[PDB]
Each structure stands twice: as C-alpha cells, then as structure tokens.
Amino acid sequence: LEIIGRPQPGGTGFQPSASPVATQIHWLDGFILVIIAAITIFVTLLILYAVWRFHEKRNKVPARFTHNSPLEIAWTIVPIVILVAIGAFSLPVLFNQQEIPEADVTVKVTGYQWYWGYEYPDEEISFESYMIGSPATGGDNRMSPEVEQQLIEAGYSRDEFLLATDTAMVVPVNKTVVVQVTGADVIHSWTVPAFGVKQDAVPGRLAQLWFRAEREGIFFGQCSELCGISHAYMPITVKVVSEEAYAAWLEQHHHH
Amino acid sequence: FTRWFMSTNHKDIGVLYLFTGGLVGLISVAFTVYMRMELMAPGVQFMCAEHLESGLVKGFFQSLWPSAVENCTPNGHLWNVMITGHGILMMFFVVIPALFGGFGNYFMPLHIGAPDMAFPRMNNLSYWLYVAGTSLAVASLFAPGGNGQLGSGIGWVLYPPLSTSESGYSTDLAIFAVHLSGASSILGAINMITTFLNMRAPGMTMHKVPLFAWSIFVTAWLILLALPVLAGAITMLLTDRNFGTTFFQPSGGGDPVLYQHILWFFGHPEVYIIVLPAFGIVSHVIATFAKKPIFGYLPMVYAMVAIGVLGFVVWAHHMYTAGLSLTQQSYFMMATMVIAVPTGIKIFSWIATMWGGSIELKTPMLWALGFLFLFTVGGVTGIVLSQASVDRYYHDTYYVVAHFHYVMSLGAVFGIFAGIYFWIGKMSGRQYPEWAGKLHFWMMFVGANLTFFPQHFLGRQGMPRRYIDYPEAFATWNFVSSLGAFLSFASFLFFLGVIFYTLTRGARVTANNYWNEHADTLEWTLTSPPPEHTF
Numbered sequence: 001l002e003i004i005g006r007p008q009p010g011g012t013g014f015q016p017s018a019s020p021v022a023t024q025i026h027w028l029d030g031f032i033l034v035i036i037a038a039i040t041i042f043v044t045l046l047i048l049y050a051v052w053r054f055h056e057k058r059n060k061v062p063a064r065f066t067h068n069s070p071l072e073i074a075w076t077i078v079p080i081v082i083l084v085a086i087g088a089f090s091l092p093v094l095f096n097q098q099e100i101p102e103a104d105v106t107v108k109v110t111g112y113q114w115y116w117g118y119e120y121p122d123e124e125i126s127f128e129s130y131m132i133g134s135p136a137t138g139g140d141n142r143m144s145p146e147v148e149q150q151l152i153e154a155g156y157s158r159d160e161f162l163l164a165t166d167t168a169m170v171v172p173v174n175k176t177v178v179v180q181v182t183g184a185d186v187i188h189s190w191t192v193p194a195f196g197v198k199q200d201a202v203p204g205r206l207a208q209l210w211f212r213a214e215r216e217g218i219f220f221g222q223c224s225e226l227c228g229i230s231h232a233y234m235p236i237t238v239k240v241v242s243e244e245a246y247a248a249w250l251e252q253h254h255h256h
Numbered sequence: 257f258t259r260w261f262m263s264t265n266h267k268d269i270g271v272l273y274l275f276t277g278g279l280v281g282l283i284s285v286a287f288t289v290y291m292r293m294e295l296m297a298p299g300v301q302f303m304c305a306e307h308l309e310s311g312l313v314k315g316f317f318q319s320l321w322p323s324a325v326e327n328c329t330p331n332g333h334l335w336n337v338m339i340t341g342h343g344i345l346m347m348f349f350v351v352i353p354a355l356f357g358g359f360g361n362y363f364m365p366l367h368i369g370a371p372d373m374a375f376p377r378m379n380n381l382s383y384w385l386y387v388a389g390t391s392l393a394v395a396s397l398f399a400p401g402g403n404g405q406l407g408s409g410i411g412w413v414l415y416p417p418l419s420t421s422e423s424g425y426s427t428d429l430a431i432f433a434v435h436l437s438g439a440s441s442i443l444g445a446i447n448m449i450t451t452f453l454n455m456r457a458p459g460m461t462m463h464k465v466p467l468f469a470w471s472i473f474v475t476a477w478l479i480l481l482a483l484p485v486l487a488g489a490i491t492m493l494l495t496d497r498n499f500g501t502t503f504f505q506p507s508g509g510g511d512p513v514l515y516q517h518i519l520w521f522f523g524h525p526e527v528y529i530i531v532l533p534a535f536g537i538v539s540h541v542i543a544t545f546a547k548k549p550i551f552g553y554l555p556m557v558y559a560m561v562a563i564g565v566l567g568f569v570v571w572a573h574h575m576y577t578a579g580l581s582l583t584q585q586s587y588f589m590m591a592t593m594v595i596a597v598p599t600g601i602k603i604f605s606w607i608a609t610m611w612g613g614s615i616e617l618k619t620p621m622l623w624a625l626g627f628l629f630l631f632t633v634g635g636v637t638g639i640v641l642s643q644a645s646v647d648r649y650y651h652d653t654y655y656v657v658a659h660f661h662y663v664m665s666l667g668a669v670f671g672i673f674a675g676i677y678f679w680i681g682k683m684s685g686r687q688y689p690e691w692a693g694k695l696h697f698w699m700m701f702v703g704a705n706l707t708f709f710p711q712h713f714l715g716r717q718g719m720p721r722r723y724i725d726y727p728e729a730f731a732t733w734n735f736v737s738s739l740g741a742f743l744s745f746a747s748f749l750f751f752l753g754v755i756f757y758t759l760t761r762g763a764r765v766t767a768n769n770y771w772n773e774h775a776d777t778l779e780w781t782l783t784s785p786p787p788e789h790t791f
C-alpha cells in the first residue's frame with residue numbers, strides 16, 4: 001500500500017486528496033486564495049505607491065480632502081460582492097460536507113487518553129489503536145531502535161513515526177464510510193486531512209462524518225483537541241483497500 | 257518611591273500599565289523563545305522528564321540545554337503549561353493592559369479635555385487587580401497541577417472536561433487570575449465610559465472627539481458585556497472542580513459544548529477589545545505623518561461601532577467542528593464574513609489619508625504602515641477560516657496560529673509600538689534616537705514575518721496545535737519559524753535597550769508638539785510631559 005495521506009518535507013500545500021470532499025476543499029481554498037492574494041497585493045501596491053508618489057520630498061504641500069463618495073461607494077460594494085461570490089461557492093461545499101449520506105460501512109470511534117477505540121457495529125469488530133512508540137507498544141513516545149523496528153514490522157519506516165499506529169482502521173475503496181465520533185474522558189478530535197474530515201470527540205455526544213476514499217493507500221491523522229499530556233501521541237491510521245482485501249480483513253477478525 | 261503605585265492620576269496609572277504590560281510581555285515572549293527552541297527540530301531535546309528530578313532552579317537551567325533524544329523522555333505536560341501560560345499572559349495580562357489600561361488611561365482624558373478619570377481611586381484599584389491577577393497567573397505555573405507536576409496544561413481557553421479534571425489546584429489559581437483580570441477591565445471600562453460621557457471639555461461635541469478616544473469608548477462597552485459572561489463561564493468551571501456541580505460533565509447531565517458557547521461569547525469580543533485601540537492609534541499616527549486630516553472621520557467612528565457590535569454575534573466560528581448543526585454553521589459563517597466590510601472601510605480610509613499627503617517615514621509611521629499590510633494578511637486568513645467548509649481542514653492547525661499572530665503580534669503589537677514611539681517624548685520629556693527605532697522596526701518586520709508566515713505552510717500540511725513534537729516532514733518550516741522567533745526576540749531586547757536609553761539619556765524634548773501641526777489633538781498643546789494637574 002502506498003503512503004498517500006502524510007505531510008511531505010518542505011510542503012506548502014494541502015496533503016494529497018483521496019476523497020471528493022477533500023477535492024472540493026482544495027478547490028474552494030484555491031479559489032479564495034487567489035482572491036485574498038489579489039486583495040493583499042492590491043492593498044500593498046497602493047501603500048508602496050502612495051509612499052513613493054507622496055513622499056514629503058516629492059509632494060511638499062499636502063492635500064486636505066477627507067471625502068470621495070464614488071470611491072467610498074465603490075470600496076463598500078465591491079467587498080460585499082466579493083464576499084457574496086465566495087459564499088455562493090462555499091455554502092454548497094459546506095452542505096455536501098455536513099449532509100451525511102447512507103453508509104456502506106459504519107465505524108464508531110471513541111477517543112481516550114491517549115488512544116483511539118474503533119468498533120464496526122455491523123461486523124462485531126472492536127479494537128484499540130496506539131501510536132507505535134507509545135507505552136502500549138513498549139516505548140515512551142520517542143524514537144529509538146526498538147520503535148524503528150516496530151515501524152518496519154508494521155509496514156512503515158522511521159519517517160512515519162508519530163503518525164503510524166499499531167492497528168489501523170481498514171475500509172474498502174469507493175464506499176461511503178460513516179464515522180460516529182465520541183469522547184470517553186475529555187474532548188479529543190478525529191481527523192484525516194486526505195479525506196477532508198475532522199470531528200471533535202466530545203464526551204456525552206455522538207457526532208458523524210463521512211468520506212468516500214477514491215484510491216487505495218495509507219492516510220494519517222493526528223488528534224486535534226488538546227487532551228492532556230500525550231495529545232501529540234495518539235494518531236490515526238486509515239488503510240483504504242480493495243473490497244475483498246477488506247473482506248479478508250473482516251474474516252480474519254471473525255471468531256468461530 | 258512607592259508614591260507611583262498609590263497615585264490616582266490617570267497619567268501615572270497609564271504609565272504603570274505600560275511598564276507592567278511590557279514586563280509581562282517580556283516574560284511571555286521568553287516562553288515563546290523556549291517553545292520555538294523545542295519546535296526548531298523534530299524529536300524532543302529540551303523538555304525532558306529527567307529535568308524534573310532535579311530542583312526548580314537546577315532543572316530550569318538543564319531545560320535550556322539540548323539533550324540527545326535517547327537521554328530525553330518527552331514531557332508533554334511542560335509543553336502544555338508553557339503554551340497555556342504564554343496565551344493567558346498575552347490575552348489577559350499584556351496587550352489590553354498596554355493599549356487600554358496604558359494608552360487609554362493616559363491619553364483618552366487628554367484627548368477629550370478632561371482633567372482626570374471620573375473615579376481616580378477606582379482607576380488605581382483597577383491597576384492593582386491587574387497586578388494581583390498577573391501574580392496568580394504566574395503562581396499557577398509553580399502550583400501543583402496536571403499529571404502530578406506543576407502548572408496547568410489546558411490551553412488558554414480552559415476547555416472542560418480537561419480543565420475540570422486537571423489535578424492539583426493550579427487551574428483554580430488560573431481561574432482566579434482571570435477573575436481579577438476581568439474585574440480590572442470592568443473598572444476601567446466604567447471609568448472610560450463615565451469620563452467620556454460626563455467630563456468632555458466645553459465645546460467637545462461627540463462628533464469632535466478624536467478617533468483614539470472613540471476606540472477606547474467602544475472598547476469599554478465591549479468589555480462590559482463580554483467580561484461578565486466570562487466570569488460566569490469560569491465560575492462554573494470552578495464549581496464543577498470544587499463544589500460538586502455538573503454543568504459540563506455528561507455523567508450528571510452536563511454538556512462540555514455549553515462551556516464553549518459561553519466562553520466564545522466572550523472569546524471573540526476579546527480580540528476586538530484587543531485591536532480597537534490599535535485602530536485608534538493608527539488613525540492618529542497616520543494623520544500626523546501624512547500631514548493630512550484623517551479620511552472619513554465619521555465612517556471611521558461608525559466602522560468601529562459596526563465591528564464592535566458584529567463581534568458579539570459571530571462567536572461560534574470557534575466551534576465549526578464541535579458539533580454545530582449545518583444551520584448554525586451557515587449562519588455564523590455568513591455573520592463572520594460581514595465584519596470584513598467595515599474593517600475594509602478603515603483600511604481603505606487609512607490609505608486614502610496617505611493619498612495626496614506629504615509623507616514622513618519616521619518610526620511611528622513605519623509601525624503604522626506595517627500594521628496596514630500585516631493586519632490585512634491576518635484579516636484575510638480570518639476570512640478563509642470563516643468558511644466552515646475550509647475550517648474543517650484548518651481548525652486546530654498552525655494555519656490558525658498563523659492567522660492570529662498576524663492580527664495580534666504583527667497587528668495589535670505594531671499599534672503598541674507605533675504608540676510608544678509616537679508618545680514617549682510626550683510622556684517622558686525625552687526623545688528616542690530615530691535610527692534605533694527604524695532598526696527595531698526592520699528587525700521586528702523581518703523576524704515576525706519569518707516566524708509566522710511559514711506556519712501557514714505547516715497548517716496546510718496538517719500540523720496540529722499544542723504539540724510538543726511533530727512528524728519529520730514538518731521540520732523545514734518549523735526550523736525557519738524558530739529562526740524568525742529568535743531574531744524577533746533580538747529585536748525586542750534591542751527595543752528594551754532603546755527604551756532604557758531614551759528614558760535615562762535621550763535627547764531632551766523642548767516643544768509642546770515635537771511632530772507637526774497635523775498632530776492636532778489636545779495633548780500636543782500641553783508641555784512634554786504635561787503638567788501634573790491638567791485642565
């Protein structure tokens with residue numbers, strides 16, 4: 001399996017997209033980025049021009065005007081129009097994001113200090129996920145020869161330290177996955193950047209998210225609500241595989 | 257003598273606020289230097305559990321030298337205490353005390369021709385509540401806290417149930433600290449509002465009040481509505497921790513998300529309380545050094561009033577991933593976007609003030625020009641984050657950290673520096689050396705941009721907030737960001753040198769108005785410094 005959902009050295013962009021929702025986010029952000037870079041460059045060029053054109057050695061008697069009504073009507077309406085354009089493209093994206101479709105696969109995620117518990121209610125499967133290198137695996141949340149060995153044996157490298165977990169949430173490609181997120185002790189937050197999803201794990205509440213992964217691979221996330229001393233050390237691994245590789249994984253969990 | 261600390265004159269309280277805010281700012285900036293030392297490289301090298309077994313002072317100095325990973329057991333609790341302490345100090349005990357308690361107490365009465373605040377003894381009490389709060393905040397760092405260590409590692413907004421489960425009583429000291437800070441702010445707001453309405457000089461109609469005084473006035477109203485709410489929110493934390501209540505605990509029918517609504521109902525107004533007096537200072541500074549009256553004085557006033565009001569109906573943009581329904585998410589995103597229109601009016605009117613003027617590029621003007629550019633960078637990423645669909649990715653990442661450092665530490669802080677260089681001659685009778693103010697500006701301009709612009713990249717790559725350590729791939733831009741913070745720190749030590757030089761041996765100020773005629777408010781008609789008893 002290819003490692004796809006991961007930060008890359010020196011990266012300045014988004015993590016690669018592996019869901020339609022993530023693709024929408026990349027487009028909406030790129031659309032807004034061109035606009036706000038245009039606004040910022042515009043404002044900056046105005047300031048640099050005004051400082052150059054009206055420097056005291058070049059303009060020695062200052063004007064005195066304090067109004068210009070065509071300009072003020074312009075610079076009030078054009079922002080309003082820019083923002084309405086942004087809202088028009090971004091509200092559909094928000095609506096696609098938050099309207100939960102019908103699940104092909106259903107996973108119930110519980111956040112703990114400091115690890116994640118997964119249950120597949122249709123399959124009567126449940127397990128816990130700890131960072132490779134956490135105390136659960138024998139470590140103390142730092143790199144070491146033993147931790148590097150465990151990463152290799154699990155199919156990763158030392159580069160995936162702090163992202164890779166001992167167990168992964170396995171899902172089939174091109175299926176609608178609905179995840180139900182809650183917290184067991186404090187608030188945590190479950191996210192996978194490559195899927196464009198993030199949902200807080202609040203004790204006493206069950207909240208839902210959805211994704212449909214569009215290619216196979218490995219995708220990482222990290223807990224995203226400060227939860228205590230090992231907030232930095234309770235990540236998320238998602239493996240997207242073929243329909244029958246997924247069934248194979250299911251069957252390996254079935255007790256006869 | 258301690259005749260400074262018992263003074264009730266608004267000028268002396270303003271100076272006490274300025275200096276205290278500056279000292280606390282130095283402490284909190286020092287925390288960030290340590291933070292960025294640990295973030296400079298992946299793996300944990302400084303915040304080792306091994307350093308706890310030594311004493312407080314010995315373990316301190318061991319903490320500042322790097323260890324190899326194999327000899328360093330990561331101590332995430334110390335990281336969480338440092339960043340919590342850094343944020344609490346900034347948001348409650350540094351920038352509002354400097355802008356509002358400092359420049360507000362000193363110059364708002366001068367700007368309206370008032371001899372003093374309406375309740376001078378209330379003003380002196382407000383300063384001591386600020387120092388009491390500051391002392392509890394610092395004491396909490398050394399009190400028994402989470403995980404059987406010292407200090408509270410719960411973030412500056414104290415989300416439950418983490419904040420109500422954290423062991424020890426360090427968190428209780430932090431809550432008391434925030435109580436005292438709100439009390440100090442409420443007394444100040446009462447004084448500003450009474451003085452503004454009741455003690456203007458004869459002839460000083462409200463449409464003749466200078467913009468700075470307006471900004472303090474609007475800020476004082478936001479305080480009166482926002483801070484009592486915060487006092488409620490955090491008292492409920494105190495009663496869940498200590499008096500058996502269950503407001504935020506699901507076992508007893510509570511809801512942790514209820515706390516977030518109450519807290520952010522204060523939490524967003526808090527940032528407009530921070531920045532409005534900086535808006536006021538930018539207007540005075542830009543008018544002076546463009547040698548041109550402010551463009552659109554009345555839209556400037558109304559835009560500040562519009563921003564202040566809208567700031568109270570947008571709070572849940574801090575909660576897009578906390579379980580808001582689609583309808584709430586769509587409202588708060590649209591209400592938040594509106595704030596860009598009044599703010600843009602002020603940005604464009606500051607450029608319009610420069611336009612057609614005769615521009616003098618002295619140090620206060622450099623800070624104000626930097627403000628215009630850098631506040632715009634921070635404000636447009638705030639608009640990005642307002643899109644809940646995109647905040648899904650950016651929430652709790654360093655893209656948020658980049659946003660709010662551009663509006664706060666390259667925005668509001670630039671307004672603080674613009675004010676200090678603008679007014680130090682008027683307050684002290686001594687003038688700063690021009691070349692050093694310019695060098696301070698350019699060192700801070702380069703360093704602060706190197707510090708925080710790469711955090712946009714880290715956020716886009718998915719780096720979460722409040723992490724002691726990070727995956728290897730985030731190393732490059734974390735390294736650049738730490739170099740920028742070290743340069744920024746150098747620029748601030750140099751600034752403290754510049755202030756020390758100015759006050760002990762700076763060129764003597766002889767003029768009442770040592771700038772020019774377009775510094776046209778009443779403080780420039782008085783001596784430098786103004787007489788002990790005004791108007």
Ligand code: HEA
Nearest residue numbers: 079527531573596599600635636638639641642651660663
């Ligand atoms: C000085 C303090 C300050 C100020 C002024 C602001 C101003 C704004 N902020 Fe910010 N913010 C913070 C301090 C501040 N903020 C802090 C501390 C946090 C994190 C809290 C925490 O979690 O710890 C935060 C986080 C925060 C969030 C939550 C993000 C998250 O946690 O995921 C959001 C949501 O939208 C937000 C948006 C905005 C917007 C829309 C503005 C607007 O007011 C900005 C408007 C300004 C401009 C837009 C630029 C000028 C305008 C023009 C040039 C006109 C043309 C522009 C357009 C048409 C776009 N900020």
Ligand code: HEA
Nearest residue numbers: 278281288343346354411412664665721722723741744748
């Ligand atoms: C005013 C607000 C303010 C200011 C000025 C700063 C200044 C800095 N901050 Fe930040 N910061 C916060 C508000 C601020 N901060 C908040 C609210 C949080 C959230 C905490 C949490 O997560 O709970 C935070 C968290 C935060 C993080 C994320 C931590 C994490 O998620 O783990 C980082 C990362 O490096 C950071 C670094 C810095 C650096 C390097 C500086 C500076 O070193 C940059 C350079 C600035 C200077 C050199 C001087 C600044 C001037 C003054 C402060 C004026 C006082 C002086 C006078 C009156 C003379 N701080």
Ligand SMILES: CCCCCCCCCCO[C@@H]1O[C@H](CO)[C@@H](O[C@H]2O[C@H](CO)[C@@H](O)[C@H](O)[C@H]2O)[C@H](O)[C@H]1O
Nearest residue numbers: 289293294296297298299301322323324325742745746
């Ligand atoms: C104006 C005043 C501002 C004060 C700023 C103080 C700056 C101090 C810089 C710290 O020095 C570096 O710290 C790194 C640790 O982050 C070390 O990383 C190296 O050494 C570590 C071992 O401790 C390894 O784990 C790292 O991978 C490796 O990059 C490195 O040797 C060391 O030179």
Ligand SMILES: CCCCCCCCCCO[C@@H]1O[C@H](CO)[C@@H](O[C@H]2O[C@H](CO)[C@@H](O)[C@H](O)[C@H]2O)[C@H](O)[C@H]1O
Nearest residue numbers: 267271274275278279676680683684685755759785788
């Ligand atoms: C990082 C911090 C940021 C720095 C903020 C800027 C510092 C503010 C100015 C310093 O304080 C001033 O110092 C003057 C010293 O010359 C005093 O003059 C005083 O001098 C005599 C005593 O020295 C008094 O009798 C007079 O009333 C009075 O004119 C003046 O009162 C006082 O306000």
Ligand SMILES: CCCCCCCCCCO[C@@H]1O[C@H](CO)[C@@H](O[C@H]2O[C@H](CO)[C@@H](O)[C@H](O)[C@H]2O)[C@H](O)[C@H]1O
Nearest residue numbers: 689690691692695696699745746747748749750751753
């Ligand atoms: C811990 C942080 C460390 C930060 C390091 C700061 C380094 C400071 C550089 C010192 O050199 C200074 O350069 C000034 C500017 O060139 C000189 O001003 C000289 O040049 C100016 C012209 O620019 C004149 O206004 C002055 O009168 C004249 O003294 C000044 O003499 C000289 O001492």
Ligand SMILES: CCCCCCCCCCO[C@@H]1O[C@H](CO)[C@@H](O[C@H]2O[C@H](CO)[C@@H](O)[C@H](O)[C@H]2O)[C@H](O)[C@H]1O
Nearest residue numbers: 688689690691692749750751752753754755757758763
């Ligand atoms: C922790 C870091 C601490 C770093 C603190 C450094 C900040 C203090 C800068 C002091 O610089 C002074 O600036 C003056 C310029 O304003 C110079 O006067 C020079 O310039 C005047 C001309 O403007 C002459 O009249 C003077 O005689 C001549 O000495 C003076 O030499 C120089 O020392």
Ligand SMILES: CCCCCCCCCCO[C@@H]1O[C@H](CO)[C@@H](O[C@H]2O[C@H](CO)[C@@H](O)[C@H](O)[C@H]2O)[C@H](O)[C@H]1O
Nearest residue numbers: 692749750751752753754755756757758759760761762
């Ligand atoms: C009281 C409570 C504690 C207060 C904390 C503030 C402590 C800061 C002390 C800084 O004092 C300055 O130190 C510089 C030397 O280290 C001197 O600049 C000198 O060195 C600069 C750099 O070379 C030159 O530009 C200048 O010309 C030259 O005056 C400067 O005169 C002097 O005033």
Ligand SMILES: OC[C@H]1O[C@H](O[C@H]2[C@H](O)[C@@H](O)[C@@H](O)O[C@@H]2CO)[C@H](O)[C@@H](O)[C@@H]1O
Nearest residue numbers: 088090091092093094095096097099586
């Ligand atoms: O993604 C497209 C989106 O379109 C519709 O959503 C509308 C909604 O119906 C209207 O009330 C409007 O005000 O908001 C949305 C604008 O996109 C569909 O209802 C929705 O299911 C679909 O995802």
Ligand SMILES: CCCCCCCCCCCCC
Nearest residue numbers: 012013014036037040633712
């Ligand atoms: C594919 C690389 C994207 C790099 C974009 C950098 C985003 C920087 C955000 C800052 C916006 C301020 C105008």
Ligand SMILES: CCCCCCCCCCCCC
Nearest residue numbers: 017022023026027028030031
């Ligand atoms: C202005 C937006 C530029 C386009 C964004 C790139 C899209 C990234 C994902 C596309 C991959 C589709 C499978």
Ligand SMILES: CCCCCCCCCCCCC
Nearest residue numbers: 127166167168170241245249
């Ligand atoms: C309790 C098991 C959770 C999954 C652990 C790792 C996933 C195994 C890989 C599944 C098929 C990959 C091709």
Ligand SMILES: CCCCCCCCCCCCC
Nearest residue numbers: 283286287290315316319334
């Ligand atoms: C001189 C006191 C200001 C704080 C300096 C920042 C360094 C903090 C080191 C923390 C050491 C852990 C006990």
Ligand SMILES: CCCCCCCCCCCCC
Nearest residue numbers: 289290293319320321322323
């Ligand atoms: C090669 C052994 C380590 C050399 C680097 C030590 C850097 C220590 C910097 C300490 C900074 C104190 C604020």
Ligand SMILES: CCCCCCCCCCCCC
Nearest residue numbers: 485487488489491492495518
């Ligand atoms: C005695 C328990 C603490 C009570 C604090 C105030 C509770 C009222 C909640 C009001 C909700 C927000 C204003």
Ligand SMILES: CCCCCCCCCCCCC
Nearest residue numbers: 047051617622625626629694
């Ligand atoms: C964003 C602030 C930029 C302001 C332009 C400064 C140009 C200064 C040129 C030198 C002036 C004499 C020192």
Ligand SMILES: CCCCCCCCCCCCC
Nearest residue numbers: 690691692694695698699702
């Ligand atoms: C009279 C000379 C102008 C004073 C300029 C002082 C600052 C020069 C630029 C410094 C840039 C530092 C990065």
